[PDB]
């Protein structure tokens, strides 16, 4: 009913390509600039001379207010810095970490993040190489090929294709005589600024089935950890609303994405991704 209502609302404005969606997105962008100017969303830490080299993109810095502060191996002169933010879940908890594609020299920091926050599942929405270009460092282990950074040793335990566009990697990670299972899901064919839809949903369901109970955040990244990252988080958020049955009467995608954007820069990056989101939500409902 809340669902059918949302659906009714979407159809009534011309669906996916309705003019009003552009206006909504334009408005989200406006609120974003406004936040920067008001300093509600700042990038002091990302801008520090010690941290600048840890950003893959010079124009994508984590917001100070929600940034992930690393304290593992702090005791030994490690920096607290990683280009990543927390995003709140439906229940107000820190349900997601949105972060960039690790660089060769941030690989260790990525794993510090995964260990410190007890992450069980990572969703990667990019590829190591896209068109040109290196877009994310391999931070997982390969079959006959541990990966070692600092005190961490990553081992590939198995890997299978969940489906045509999604790889599932089962990893063991070892740090200080301790092992933990970590599952990584990688979507192979999602272009940056763009959109995949069935398999993305299978990715989210799978992630949610591996995660189980437990308060630990999901780790969601792309190349910069904005566009494709935000889409993923938003989809999981809304699916979580849905599963609960807590879709309000006045349910607004504009307000969900707005809240995302508040917590990770460019969480949903393009109008085209914004439309796709509306559409995915429709489907999830129908």
């Amino acid at each position: 009913d809340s669902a059918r209502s949302f659906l009714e609302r979407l159809e009534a404005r011309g669906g996916r390509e309705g003019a009003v969606l552009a206006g909504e997105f334009s408005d989200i962008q406006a609120c974003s600039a406004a936040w920067k100017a008001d300093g509600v969303c700042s990038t002091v830490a990302g801008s520090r001379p010690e941290n600048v080299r840890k950003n893959r993109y010079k124009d994508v810095l984590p917001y100070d207010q929600t940034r992930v502060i690393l304290s593992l191996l702090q005791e030994e002169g490690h920096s607290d810095y990683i280009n990543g933010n927390f995003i709140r879940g439906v229940d107000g908890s820190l349900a997601y970490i949105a972060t960039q594609g690790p660089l060769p020299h941030t690989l260790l920091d990525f794993w510090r993040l995964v260990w410190e926050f007890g992450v069980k599942v990572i969703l990667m929405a990019c590829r190591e190489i896209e068109n040109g270009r290196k877009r994310c460092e391999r931070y997982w282990a390969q079959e006959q090929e541990p990966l070692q950074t600092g005190l961490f040793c990553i081992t590939l335990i198995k890997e299978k294709w969940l489906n045509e566009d999604i790889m599932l990697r089962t990893l063991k990670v070892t740090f200080q005589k301790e092992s933990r299972s970590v599952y990584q899901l990688q979507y192979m064919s999602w272009p940056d600024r763009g959109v995949p839809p069935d398999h993305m949903l299978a990715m989210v369901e799978e992630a949610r089935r591996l995660q189980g109970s437990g308060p630990e955040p999901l780790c969601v990244h792309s190349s910069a950890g904005c566009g494709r990252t935000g889409v993923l988080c938003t989809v999981d958020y809304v699916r979580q609303l849905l599963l609960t049955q807590m879709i309000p009467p006045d349910f607004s995608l504009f307000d969900v994405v707005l809240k995302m954007r508040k917590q990770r820069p460019a969480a949903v990056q393009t109008e085209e991704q914004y439309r796709f989101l509306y559409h995915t939500v429709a489907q999830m409902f129908c």
Binding site: R56, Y57, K58, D59, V60, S223, A266, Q269
Partner: peptide
């Protein structure tokens, strides 16, 4: 490189 442009 910049990611947004």
């Amino acid at each position: 490189p910049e990611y947004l442009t």
